[PDB]
Amino acid sequence: SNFLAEQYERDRKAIINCCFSRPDHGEPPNNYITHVRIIEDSKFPSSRPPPDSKLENKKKRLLILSAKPNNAKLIQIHKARENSDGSFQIGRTWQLTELVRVEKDLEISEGFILTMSKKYYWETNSAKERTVFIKSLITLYIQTFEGHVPELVNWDLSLFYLDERSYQRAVIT
Amino acid sequence: SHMDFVAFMNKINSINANLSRYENIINQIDAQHKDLLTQVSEEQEMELRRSLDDYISQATDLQYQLKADIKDAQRDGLHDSNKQAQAENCRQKFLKLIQDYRIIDSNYKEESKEQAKRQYTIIQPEATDEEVEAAINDVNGQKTALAEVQARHQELLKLEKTMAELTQLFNDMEELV
């Protein structure tokens, strides 16, 4: 009934407990912002997987947005996974300034492409989860880099409270 | 009830009136920015900044009023689908204009930095490109060109404060859905 929101709170509490609670050796940990569950195809990581990609290729992962503790303007993107014992663990980290292009898959309601140095194809579990997370990602970018946006491909600009006029004035291109 | 209906619609009409009023102010600010980047006399620049400061002040006041009226209208539509939709529509249009204002001040900040950099190459012809960027990015070290660098430096600080206000207002309105 209300499983989506309730599982988001469990994931949030567990992500914070496993990844954003113990200090390093030696700032305090980063500050969690948001996350989303994703499907990653290990054979087709950079483009839309063909329909006949076997299910063994599909891996359960998560994308996480966080901020450095002493600088709320330094945002990082993380890819995480659930270990066999249930612990969450971050495996890959980008700086938000690396995000250059964000594209919506016109044929798959859950798919999207993020471009840093490489292209990364992922899918959310549902169509609504792609809309909410990408809105959070772009909104956080405009706020972080003072009215700038990465290149946006095939999105409704009103999702980010933009129009064609304000997008052209703000895009990094 | 009839009177209950026009009461809520009077709230929506008032919000929509202040919304278009807010949009005009934002465009007047953008125009004052671009006129201030032209060659103007001292008295002409004082007149332009008088209107700009007034417009900025009106924008802050309308942001307070739109924030309160939109939140109040949303509470009136907690169990009425039609009231909820109209109030939500007002909330989305408000956020789009806040995004316009943020982007407009962002453009002006860049072009004001580029003007301050080119104005720093005159006061220090021997200074390198990196020393120019480092000097403009506050702080370390502060002719007609000297007063403008100090002026645009104090203006960049107030632009960053205004854009921080818009970020806070933007997030205050997102804690509504």
Numbering used by the authors:
A (entry chain B): 75 to 99, 102 to 249
B (entry chain A): 33 to 174, 191 to 225
Quote the original article:
The exocyst is an evolutionarily conserved octameric protein complex that mediates the tethering of post-Golgi secretory vesicles to the plasma membrane. Most syntaxin proteins contain an N-terminal region that autonomously folds into a three-helix bundle (the ‘Habc domain') that interacts intramolecularly with their SNARE motif to generate a ‘closed' conformation, which, in many cases, blocks its assembly into the SNARE complex345678910. The rate-limiting step is the interaction between Sso and Sec9, which is hindered by the auto-inhibition of Sso. Here we report that the exocyst subunit Sec3 directly interacts with Sso1/2, and promotes the initial assembly of the Sso-Sec9 t-SNARE complex and stimulates membrane fusion.
We have obtained the crystal structure of the Sec3–Sso2 complex under two different crystallization conditions, both of which demonstrate that the binding of Sec3 leads to conformational changes on Sso that is crucial for the relief of its auto-inhibition. The interface between Sec3N and Sso2 is ∼700 Å2, which is mediated primarily by 13 hydrogen bonds and 10 salt bridges. The seven main interface residues on Sec3 consist of K149, Q219, E222, H224, Y237, R241 and R245, which together describe a horseshoe-like shape on a relatively flat surface of the Sec3 PH domain. These residues provide a platform to make extensive contacts with Hc of Sso2, and some contacts with the SNARE motif of Sso2. In the Sso2-Sec3 crystal structure, the N terminus of the H3 domain bends approximately 22° away from its original position, and is tilted towards the Ha domain. The crystal structure suggests that Sec3 interaction causes the bending of the SNARE motif, which then led to the disruption of the hydrophobic interactions in the core of Sso2 involving HL2. Such changes could facilitate the release of the SNARE motif of Sso2 from its Habc domain when Sec9 is available. The four Sec3/Sso2 dimers in the two crystal forms are essentially identical. Both the bending of the SNARE motif N-terminus and the relaxation of HL2 of Sso2 described above are found in all four copies of the Sec3/Sso2 complex present in the two different crystal forms.
